[PDB]
């Protein structure tokens, strides 16, 4: 298939992998810090999805240095992946408009 479409799929796979690794690592980083709520895997995975999409509910977040570093990798992976899908959609529409104009 075309590059952009492939890169998108790849982006979707890496993101899913980042979500899972991120959930596991967040718990590992947060347990041990009194007050931390990002300490069980199921909600940590919900936290990972919230972070990747920047939905901003604010119901969960890391309070430790390492947890925050993990958060940044997930945010960037999410913002980048969704942004990459936008670019793929753009390349797709541009190719079609070219045809439609007989170019």
């Amino acid at each position, epitope marked *: 298939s075309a590059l952009h479409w492939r890169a998108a799929g790849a982006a979707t796979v890496l993101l899913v992998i980042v979500l899972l690794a991120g959930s596991y690592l967040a*718990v590992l980083a947060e*347990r*041990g810090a*009194p*007050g*931390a*709520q990002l*300490i*069980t*895997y199921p909600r940590a995975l919900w936290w990972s999805v919230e972070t990747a999409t920047t939905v901003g509910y604010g119901d969960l977040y890391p309070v430790t240095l390492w947890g925050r570093c993990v958060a940044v990798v997930v945010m960037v992976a999410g913002i980048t992946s969704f942004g990459l899908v936008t670019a793929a959609l753009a390349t797709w529409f541009v190719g079609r408009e070219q045809e439609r104009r007989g170019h």
Partner: antibody, heavy 118, light 106 residues
């Protein structure tokens, strides 16, 4: 079958130290945490600390003096709690429990009764 | 550290009656509260997880309710084998903590 196996007892001299063991069986996941809980005769349950074998990291109760040190052998899937410089205040039943990383202690060992005296 | 208050410390009831144990958290913890039963010389046993979820292998006369800071463990038609100590435990914030326990007496 019995998911967690602990020795029934340990006698320790005041000042000495002992290493409690907890052999686990049944399903095992990298997300498993092994906890240790202390119960003095007549009193309640006191969380001591936890450890995640799949990584070897451990956390301890900060509100109490640190008498324990946790470790785990992934091959023999056994968890250990090193208690050191014990006094009579350390005499109690020490339970180990398994948590699937979802907050609750699904299974507990029978507990090891530790007595500190000469 | 989340403080879990279990009061009264002792609860006396007649056979077959419905009984309720109380557990108050020092701050809101959603439904991240779990209940254990510990009989004489026995080790703790999970009865209810996440405030109201039944555990397979536990009699249906055991149920839980509540959210936020107030939780209740209930036993419908109490019977002799229920004689024991009951503890609540929270997993909302680190570190996990236990309540002081309530003893059931018939």
């Amino acid at each position: 079958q019995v998911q967690l196996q602990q020795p029934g007892a340990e006698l320790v001299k005041p000042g000495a130290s002992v290493k409690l063991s907890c052999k686990a069986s049944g399903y095992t996941f990298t997300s498993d945490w092994i906890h240790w809980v202390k119960q003095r005769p007549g009193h309640g349950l006191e969380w001591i600390g936890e450890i995640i074998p799949s990584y070897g990291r451990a956390n301890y109760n900060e509100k109490i003096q640190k008498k324990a040190t946790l470790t785990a052998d992934k091959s023999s899937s056994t968890a250990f709690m090193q208690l050191s410089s014990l006094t009579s205040e350390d005499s109690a039943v020490y339970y180990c429990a398994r948590e699937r990383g979802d907050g609750y202690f699904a299974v507990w060992g029978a507990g090891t009764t530790v007595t500190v005296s000469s | 550290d989340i403080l879990l208050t279990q009061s009264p410390a002792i609860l006396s009831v007649s056979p077959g009656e419905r009984v309720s144990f109380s557990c108050r958290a020092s701050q809101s913890i959603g439904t991240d509260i779990h209940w254990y039963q510990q009989r004489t010389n026995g080790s703790p046993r999970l009865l209810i997880k996440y405030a109201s979820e039944s555990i397979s292998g536990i009699p249906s006369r055991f149920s839980g309710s509540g959210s936020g800071t107030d939780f209740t463990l209930s036993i419908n038609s109490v019977e002799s084998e229920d004689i024991a100590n009951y503890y609540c435990q929270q997993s909302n914030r680190w570190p996990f903590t236990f309540g002081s326990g309530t003893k059931l007496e018939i």
